[PDB]
Each structure stands twice: as structure tokens, then as C-alpha cells.
Design a binder for this molecule. Structure first.
Ligand SMILES: CNc1cc(CN(CC2CCNCC2)S(=O)(=O)c2ccc(S(=O)(=O)N(Cc3ccc(Cl)cc3)C3CCCC3)cc2)ccc1C(=O)O
Length: 149
């Protein structure tokens, strides 16, 4: 179908160039990288600081390029611990200009009544599953395993 082909076209033209995470309260950099974690079909790894688990909120800046136009570019993310989905996040970018490069700032908060497990338990056992959409159209599904260091 036209939609399966369009999805592959967007994937082909897409690149994550860089990304960082900051403590939202203080603005301090917690993590930054230039690995394209959007690449599907391989398990990526990232090492984040234990500290992050103590942040009430984390600000993420994500930089990407797209050759293809997108009407409603958005992400769905799932936080799995040992195969169990603990939390589900939804972020919207909206409209993407063909052959543009864009910086996308999002704010991450865990539910207020949730208490974080220690880093030592979590480390190596957290997978972040990210789905890239243009509206209803699934472009890419990627996985990153997290180590808390
Ligand atoms: C809700 N439960 C938890 C959630 C988390 C997820 N954390 C969010 C924090 C928890 C503390 N309060 C503030 C929010 S996290 O610190 O481990 C975290 C931060 C950021 C991300 S991320 O989605 O922004 N991102 C993964 C990512 C981002 C973009 C794309 Cl395209 C692909 C993958 C980063 C890339 C390098 C490391 C993580 C994922 C998990 C951790 C532990 C628990 C727990 O119950 O023990």
C-alpha cells in the first residue's frame, strides 16, 4: 500500500543528529550524544547518570533532519523494566518542512504518585521503546537499553 511505501520514504530521509538531556530545575547537562538512536532493528545502548532518577523533570533537546515533509510528526515512547511497561509517553512535533533540520525540546515527568527503583536494580533492565509517527503512519520503531552509572 501507498502508506507502507510513504513510511519507508520518511524513514529513508530521516536522521537523528544529536540529543541531550538536562535537569529541568537547574538546566545542567545530564547526558548528550550523537548516536542515531532512531535506527530500527538493532539494540542501542546508553549510559545515563544515577542522578537522573532523582530529577522531578528532565528536559530533552533532540535534533533531526528529514528530507520528507511530515504533516504530524510525533513520538510514542514506552519504558519497559524486565519486559513490563511501566510508563507510556506521547510527544508531538507537528509539521516538518522537507529538507529541514530541526531542534525539538520536550519535557519528561514520571507520574506524581510513582516512586523510582534504585539505579542498581534498574541498570541493564530498562528498555526504552520509541515509535516515530507521521500522524497514524508508523515510520520507525527503535529500542535503547539503559545503564545507570
Ligand atoms: C516511570 N518509571 C520509571 C521511569 C524511568 C524513566 N526515567 C525518566 C525519569 C525518571 C525520574 N524522574 C524524571 C523522569 S529515565 O531517567 O531513565 C529516562 C530519561 C530520558 C529518556 S529518553 O526517552 O528521553 N532517551 C531515550 C530515547 C530518546 C529519544 C529517542 Cl529518539 C530514542 C530513545 C534518552 C536517550 C539516552 C538515554 C535516554 C528515557 C528514560 C526510570 C525509572 C522508573 C522507575 O519506576 O524506576
Amino acid at each position: 500500500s501507498a502508506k507502507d511505501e510513504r513510511a519507508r520514504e520518511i524513514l529513508r530521509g530521516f536522521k537523528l543528529n544529536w540529543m541531550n538531556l538536562r535537569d529541568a530545575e537547574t538546566g545542567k547537562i545530564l547526558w548528550q550524544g550523537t548516536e542515531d538512536l532512531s535506527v530500527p532493528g538493532v539494540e542501542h545502548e546508553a549510559r545515563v547518570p544515577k542522578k537522573i532518577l532523582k530529577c522531578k523533570a528532565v528536559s530533552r533537546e533532540l535534533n533531526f533532519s528529514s528530507t520528507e515533509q511530515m504533516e504530524k510528526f510525533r513520538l510514542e515512547q514506552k519504558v519497559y523494566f524486565k519486559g513490563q511497561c511501566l510508563e507510556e509517553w506521547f510527544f508531538e512535533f507537528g509539521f516538518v518542512i522537507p529538507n529541514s533540520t530541526n531542534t525539538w525540546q520536550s519535557l519528561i515527568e514520571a507520574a506524581p504518585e510513582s516512586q523510582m527503583m534504585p539505579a542498581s536494580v534498574l541498570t541493564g533492565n530498562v528498555i526504552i521503546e520509541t515509535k516515530f509517527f507521521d500522524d497514524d503512519l508508523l515510520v520507525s520503531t527503535s529500542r535503547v537499553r539503559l545503564f545507570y552509572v
